[PDB]
Design an enzyme around this catalytic site. Structure first.
Site, PDB file in Angstrom:
ATOM      1  N   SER A 160     -57.196 -91.088 -53.974  1.00  0.00           N
ATOM      2  CA  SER A 160     -57.757 -91.738 -55.285  1.00  0.00           C
ATOM      3  C   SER A 160     -57.914 -90.522 -56.319  1.00  0.00           C
ATOM      4  CB  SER A 160     -59.027 -92.692 -54.888  1.00  0.00           C
ATOM      5  OG  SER A 160     -59.677 -92.950 -56.056  1.00  0.00           O
ATOM      6  N   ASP A 199     -54.197-105.080 -39.060  1.00  0.00           N
ATOM      7  CA  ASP A 199     -54.999-104.015 -39.394  1.00  0.00           C
ATOM      8  C   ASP A 199     -54.188-102.855 -39.607  1.00  0.00           C
ATOM      9  OD1 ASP A 199     -56.802-101.981 -39.089  1.00  0.00           O
ATOM     10  OD2 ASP A 199     -57.160-102.050 -36.970  1.00  0.00           O
TER      11      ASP A 199
END
EC number: 3.4.23.22
Length: 330
Positions: A199, A35
């Site tokens: 992004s 994770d």
């Protein structure tokens, strides 16, 4: 040193991925959920409340000659989906894919929430976010990656998740045969303890690319792609019959649909998520309503590039003094 381990979807929907991890001496092999959005290595154990164990393999520190109680240390964690676990702490030898760390904090669960109990295939979590998020008190502990770093050939790990197929986590090297083209690297902020990056925009299907900054986290422990409501609405508007259902808890779409791809930007590069990766199947057995793999982050408080996004790429988690993230097509 290096390590290389195969990671395998837990079910036919890629709801999560498990990776075998050797703990203790002699080795006890547990299948852990790696994770990158948390920083605790915790396991089902011989200390876990019996009624909260249902099929998991447990770590038994009393059977490990290298286990030592970390006296006074406790841990307690709550995740974004409302699940939780807590317990005490041992140090022991932990190996992933041939890479061994001695003195790793192994957090032994005394209690786990129902979602963990119900997940018989997941024996615990191995956190790979920054150690500043580790929950051990009163002495915070380091992640497996942070402990391994000094010994690694290069201070990196990579995630290469499969779509309905196994993939690979590598530590200490970049497998140049595992991706196509070049890797594009992008800046990381560690201010919140995550692999947080921005992004450069998105496209829906064959549509034009929208240049827009989207801050979010690279999180292998989250199944889906969670993005701003504007982005998600633009995606689902291209699927006839798709709608957001408060009763179901997100966007659903007719199972008869063909889903468009979704592209996200990494600098000037583009990662394309095929439409099929966005199909999470019937909402309940036999239903003709299917659950979407792109969902709104509104009310999460953060955008999450979970497995839906990451499995479309070869992803480099560069833990150099100034960390960065790299993405390549594959």
């Amino acid at each position: 040193s290096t390590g290389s381990a195969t990671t395998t979807p837990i079910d036919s929907l890629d709801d999560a991925y498990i990776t075998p991890v050797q703990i203790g001496t002699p080795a006890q092999t547990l299948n852990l959920d790696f994770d990158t959005g948390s920083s605790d290595l915790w396991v089902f154990s011989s200390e876990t409340t019996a009624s909260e164990v249902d099929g998991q393999t447990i770590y038994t520190p009393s059977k490990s000659t290298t286990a030592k109680l970390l006296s006074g240390a406790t841990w307690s964690i709550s995740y974004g989906d409302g699940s939780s676990s807590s317990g005490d702490v041992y140090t022991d030898t932990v190996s992933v894919g041939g890479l061994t760390v001695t003195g790793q904090a192994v957090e032994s669960a005394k209690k786990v929430s129902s979602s963990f109990t119900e997940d018989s295939t997941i024996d615990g979590l191995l956190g790979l976010a920054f150690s500043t998020l580790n929950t051990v008190s009163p002495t915070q502990q380091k992640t497996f990656f942070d402990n391994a770093k000094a010994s690694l050939d290069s201070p990196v790990f990579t995630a290469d998740l499969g779509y309905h197929a196994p993939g690979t986590y590598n530590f200490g090297f970049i497998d140049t045969t595992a991706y196509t083209g070049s890797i594009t690297y992008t800046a990381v902020s560690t201010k919140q303890g995550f692999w947080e990056w921005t992004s450069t925009g998105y496209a829906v299907g064959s549509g034009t690319f929208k240049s827009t900054s989207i801050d979010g986290i690279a999180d292998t422990g989250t199944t889906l792609l969670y993005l701003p409501a504007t982005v998600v609405s633009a995606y689902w508007a291209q699927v006839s019959g798709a709608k957001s259902s408060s009763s179901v808890g997100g966007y659903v779409f007719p199972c008869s649909a063909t889903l468009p791809s979704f592209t996200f930007g990494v600098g000037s590069a583009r990662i394309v998520i095929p439409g099929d990766y966005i199909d999470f199947g019937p909402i309940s057995t036999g239903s003709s309503s299917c659950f979407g793999g792109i969902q709104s982050s509104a009310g999460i408080g953060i955008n999450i590039f979970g497995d839906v996004a990451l499995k479309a790429a070869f992803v480099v988690f560069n833990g150099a003094t100034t960390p960065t993230l790299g993405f390549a097509s594959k």
